[PDB]
Amino acid sequence: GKACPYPFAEMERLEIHPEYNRLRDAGELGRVLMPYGGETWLATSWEDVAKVFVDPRFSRSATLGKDVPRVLPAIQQPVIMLMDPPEHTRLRRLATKALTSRRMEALRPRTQEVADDLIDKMLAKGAPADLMEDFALPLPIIMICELLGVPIEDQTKFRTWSDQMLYSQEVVMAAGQSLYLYLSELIAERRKQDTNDLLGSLVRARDKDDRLSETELVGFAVTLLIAGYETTANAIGNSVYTLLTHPEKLAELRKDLSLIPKAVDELLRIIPIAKQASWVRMAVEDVELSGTIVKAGEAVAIQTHSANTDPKVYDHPEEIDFHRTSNPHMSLGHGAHHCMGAQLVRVEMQTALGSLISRIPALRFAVPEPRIKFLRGRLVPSLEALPLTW
Ligand code: HEM
Structure with a gap:
């Protein structure tokens, strides 16, 4: 047992374990033992992490139903993000025609209404409130629903199931099938009314004579929903908790908003x-990675935080600066698996702070910052509550 057990981290708050920044600033490639599957390489530098996304000598196709190192015991499922060419660069090529940077910016108007909408009842109801449930937690579902085409009537019955995918299996997979068949249904309707919709134009999207089949269509559809719900809530709620940890940095925004774009990639x-x-x-081939030489069939995991705070790429890398002349961060990914939600994540977080920071200037933590509790759950850090007062 050369390799330390990965059960080493802790999501107490928004803290990262120091190993990531010791490995980066010394041992090119580090080795750790995952609780399930074997042990695995741990890339931590900007240099290596960038590579692990872009180097075709790194297959993620070759993980479908394999005994690979992992943190969960569930063995993953043919998804856009566990594919590689020519299947991935075909699926994604067809989808990006419908999920353009244009369509997602055109959502900004609606997204305004919805933030305004939410602080409105949030203000109306009286302080103290809780932003995770009260405003950040829904904003992104209401925005995903609008994107796909989920009609107003079915909207609150969508949240029914879409939140039943978190707490049993006889309700989550009920909620699974209940949402597969609902979406497959809804797509059928967009083929009838050939709309200016996203489900509308995924059908109508064709490369030469290629097209997405019922199960690529529905499969892609459903994948946005899961990609864009729980991680846009957490982008927002945390980004606030952080912004509120640096009042220095609020006032700079509050009493100036031309920086909202640059401050989101920063946050x-x-x-x-x-x-x-x-x-x-x-x-899938022998590739020298950050010093050490990853043998083919050997496994590697990217930590983004350490890449994004690499002193080799970011000057003053642990200070928050909204004036950065260039921000090649990895939070939204790199290469041909660039987050296709990207344009929407920016127009969501911008106008969500864009609003909150003005519409509630004197917006402050309700309870001592130390006392705010985070979910002892898993995957990405989540906020039990974000209790605020004004
Ligand atoms: C709001 C709607 C969003 C949608 C619809 C969405 C959808 C996707 C999809 C489909 C991919 C995979 C692209 C591919 O392999 O072809 C992707 C990648 C990614 N998304 Fe998102 N996303 C969204 C928001 C976010 C947010 C808020 C984050 C916040 C951290 C995020 C982080 C990522 C990352 C890190 C990747 C890298 C993919 C990889 O290399 O494995 N996404 N997104």
Whole structure:
């Protein structure tokens, strides 16, 4: 047992274990033992982490139903993000035609209404309130629903199931099938009314004579929903808790808002998007990675935080600066698996702070900052409550 047990981290708050920044600033490649599957390499530098996303000598296809190192015991499922060419660069090519940077910016108007909408009842109801449930937690579902085309009537019955996928199996997989068949149904309707919708234009999207089949269509559909619900809530709620930890940095925004774009990529990079590392990638060829030489069939996991705070790429890398002349962060990913939610995450977080920071200037923690509790759950860090007062 050269390799330390990965059960080493803790998601107490938005803290990261020091190993990541010792390994980066010394041992190119570090080795740790995952509780399930074997042991695995741990890339931590900007250099290596960038590579693990982009190097075709790193298959993620070759993880479908394999005994690979991991943190969960569930063995993952043919998804856009466990594919590789030519299947991935075909699926994603067809989808990106419907899920354009245009369509997602055109959502900004609606997204305004919805933030305004939420602080409105949130203000109306009286302080103290709790932003996770009260405003950040729904904003992104209401925005995902609008994107796909989920009609107003079915909207509150969508949240029914979409939140039944967290607490049993005879209700989550009920909620599974209940949402598969609901979406497959809804797509059928967009083929009838060939809309200016996203489900509308995924059908109508064709590369030469290629098209998405019922199970690629529904499969892609459902994947947005899971990608964009729980991680846009947590992008927001945390980013606030952080912004509120640096009042220095609020006033700079509050009494200036031309920086909302630049401050979001900033607030992303600085904040860990997960409590553990990533979904271990598999070397299909021998590739020297950050000094050490990953043998083919050997596994490696990317930590983004350490990449995003690499003193080799970021000057003053642990201070928050909204004036950074350039921000090549990894929080939203790199290469041909660039987050396709990207444009929407930016227009959501911008206008969500864009609003809150103005519409509630004197918005402050209700309870001592130390006393705010985080979920002892898993995957990415979540806020039990974000109790605020005004
Ligand atoms: C709001 C709607 C969102 C949608 C619809 C969405 C969808 C996706 C999809 C489909 C991918 C995989 C792309 C591919 O392999 O072809 C992706 C990647 C990614 N998304 Fe999102 N996303 C969203 C928001 C976010 C947010 C808020 C975060 C916050 C951290 C995030 C983090 C990531 C990361 C890190 C990747 C890297 C993919 C990889 O290399 O494995 N996404 N997103």
